[PDB]
Structure 1
Amino acid sequence: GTSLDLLRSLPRVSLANLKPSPNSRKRERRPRDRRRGRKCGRGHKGERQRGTRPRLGFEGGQTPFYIRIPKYGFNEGHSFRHQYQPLSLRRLQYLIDLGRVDPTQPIDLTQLVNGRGVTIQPLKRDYGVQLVEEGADTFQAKINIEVQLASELAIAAIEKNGGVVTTAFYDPRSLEILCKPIPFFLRGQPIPKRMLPPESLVPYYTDAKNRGYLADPAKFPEARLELAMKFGYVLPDITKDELFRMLSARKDPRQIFFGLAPGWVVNMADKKILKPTDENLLKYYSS
């Protein structure tokens, strides 16, 4: 460019020629000159001038504002409430379009996080992803996806195209392994089991209408049909579809990863998977 041609003429760049970007630094003012010296910006003698004014929120001796308001449980149990990151079909379509979420294979929270499509924070009480209806009208992809929460309209968009959506619960410990699997294989521990939902969440994940992972499989076809009629689309028979096996693939309710059983150890250095043989240890994991 023309800028580089200017460098050719100009003298060498060196440590003696450096300069910061203009206005990059403000100048700090010492209390030395008459303008900023003398009383030094503090005012005439007094409590605020000696530096001993009362604490923040003190109002000179009347009951402060933040003390005379009734105490109310807006934030009770905030640290215990569950948080589900929202994923919109617009974001899902956009990720697929640019190749960042491969639709050929099943989509699980690992793949979504692995494609920088969602950011999961188990420390801040993230327990998964909830599918968001936004973008349903323009959603034209056939995919198999597992999400901890889903909405009635969000499910309809996935299924109408012939995809599969199932809702699966991951416990706080399992989610952290799911989100960052490799920073776990490096520890050297065996893969833990996946714990069942708490009593409060059991109804949601055992219900077909929500596509629960613990729900009765025989009851799905009725649920799929009713949703199709309500939203005015024809339910597509996915058994005929060539990639039916991939669409129907589902991990065991006590399994975190698709091809890895609980209890195995992943020797990444040697590209091996140590597996136990003991009976009590195999009964513990297979339970």
Structure 2
Amino acid sequence: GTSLDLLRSLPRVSLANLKPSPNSRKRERRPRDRRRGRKHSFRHQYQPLSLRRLQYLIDLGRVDPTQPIDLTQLVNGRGVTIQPLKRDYGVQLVEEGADTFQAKINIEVQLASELAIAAIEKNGGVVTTAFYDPRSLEILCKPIPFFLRGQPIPKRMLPPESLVPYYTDAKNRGYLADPAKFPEARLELAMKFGYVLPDITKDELFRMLSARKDPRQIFFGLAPGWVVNMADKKILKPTDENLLKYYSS
């Protein structure tokens, strides 16, 4: 660093010596003299994740491959930005990276492409779709604040009748999907590509990959209606029978 050596040779700097960078500040005109003298909401605003964008996160180790993909974890890693003021209502995927993302992992995304669904399943990944209420999703993205507010964990909402067919559809692999068709559906997709179907049971970590929360359950770890002792780093569970009726309701 020859620049540093020049500083030693140069005289000690003072407050007055400081000077603004060249061209940083423009000149101004003032009237001192003659110079200035004389004279749509209903449609969900899906926020997608590109397959190429998905690929680098796994390759860079930003998201642990062993841990199932969680949208909250992506927010924790600053992978995606969700603004409640924007009233983002959904999540999607982008066709970009279809040719550059060869990997298998369990994941849940609100909306997924049918071609993408089978391709990751062909690789061995597990993909499903869940419905998060836009207000609930904002709560999900920021779980700590409502604990600060003191609010208790509410039951996850269900899709409106317009979106019920999508989630209930077996091919869409939604949480409302019929399990009976899943073994047949998995078989059908394998034939379409022709790849040899790997049964989810064969995987050693099958239970971890296939683990899913209840439709009313917002969080994998936390059941609906739960409370968290944030100050004491503990979880509080309601013990009132009437409260169970509220959760059932």
TM-score, length basis structure 1:
0.82
- Separation of aligned partners in 2, 1:181 and 1:158: 29
How far 1:164 moved relative to its partner?
A: 0.5
- Asked if structure 1 preserves the Cα contact closer than 8 Å seen for 2:155 and 2:216, the reply is yes
- Separation of aligned partners in 1, 2:12 and 2:193: 71
How far 1:219 moved relative to its partner?
A: 0.8
Q: Find the residue that maps to 1:221 and give its secondary structure.
A: helix
- Separation of aligned partners in 2, 1:218 and 1:132: 30
How far 1:87 moved relative to its partner?
A: 0.6
How far 1:124 moved relative to its partner?
A: 1.3
How far 1:172 moved relative to its partner?
A: 2.0
- Separation of aligned partners in 2, 1:246 and 1:89: 23
How far 1:14 moved relative to its partner?
A: 2.5
What's the counterpart of residue 238 of structure 2? 276
- Separation of aligned partners in 2, 1:245 and 1:14: 68
How far 1:149 moved relative to its partner?
A: 0.5
Q: Find the residue that maps to 1:16 and give its secondary structure.
A: coil
What's the counterpart of residue 78 of structure 2? 116
- Separation of aligned partners in 2, 1:237 and 1:20: 68
- Asked if structure 1 preserves the Cα contact closer than 8 Å seen for 2:110 and 2:130, the reply is yes
- Separation of aligned partners in 2, 1:108 and 1:253: 16
**Aligned ranges 1:132-151 → 2 under 5 Å:** 132-151=94-113
How far 1:116 moved relative to its partner?
A: 1.1
CA deviation vs aligned residue, 1:79-99 (integer Å, no higher than 9, x gap): 333111011111111111111
CA deviation vs aligned residue, 1:104-152 (integer Å, no higher than 9, x gap): 1111211121111111123312123112232122222211111111111
Q: Find the residue that maps to 1:86 and give its secondary structure.
A: strand
What's the counterpart of residue 37 of structure 1? 37
How far 1:267 moved relative to its partner?
A: 1.3
Q: Find the residue that maps to 1:183 and give its secondary structure.
A: helix
How far 1:255 moved relative to its partner?
A: 0.6
> Percent identity between the aligned chains?
100
- Separation of aligned partners in 2, 1:184 and 1:141: 35
Gapped runs of 5+ residues in structure 1? 40-77
- Separation of aligned partners in 2, 1:282 and 1:13: 72
What's the counterpart of residue 121 of structure 2? 159
- Asked if structure 2 preserves the Cα contact closer than 8 Å seen for 1:88 and 1:135, the reply is yes
CA deviation vs aligned residue, 1:212-238 (integer Å, no higher than 9, x gap): 111111111222222232234222223
- Separation of aligned partners in 1, 2:85 and 2:8: 54
| Aligned CA distance change for structure 1 residues 157 and 37 (closer, same or farther; 3 Å) | farther
How far 1:284 moved relative to its partner?
A: 1.3
How far 1:162 moved relative to its partner?
A: 0.3
Q: How many residue pairs are counted as aligned between the two chains?
A: 249
- Separation of aligned partners in 2, 1:269 and 1:186: 10
How far 1:169 moved relative to its partner?
A: 0.5
- Asked if structure 2 preserves the Cα contact closer than 8 Å seen for 1:90 and 1:139, the reply is yes
CA deviation vs aligned residue, 1:4-23 (integer Å, no higher than 9, x gap): 11111112222121112211
CA deviation vs aligned residue, 1:11-59 (integer Å, no higher than 9, x gap): 22221211122111111112344343312xxxxxxxxxxxxxxxxxxxx
| Aligned CA distance change for structure 1 residues 222 and 27 (closer, same or farther; 3 Å) | same
- Asked if structure 2 preserves the Cα contact closer than 8 Å seen for 1:262 and 1:286, the reply is no
- Asked if structure 1 preserves the Cα contact closer than 8 Å seen for 2:44 and 2:90, the reply is no
Which has the larger displacement, 28-37 or 191-200?
28-37
| Aligned CA distance change for structure 1 residues 227 and 122 (closer, same or farther; 3 Å) | farther
The RMSD of aligned alpha carbons is: 1.6
- Asked if structure 1 preserves the Cα contact closer than 8 Å seen for 2:90 and 2:134, the reply is no
CA deviation vs aligned residue, 1:173-195 (integer Å, no higher than 9, x gap): 21011111112222222101111
Q: Find the residue that maps to 2:85 and give its secondary structure.
A: helix
- Larger-gyration structure (1/2): 1
What's the counterpart of residue 178 of structure 1? 140
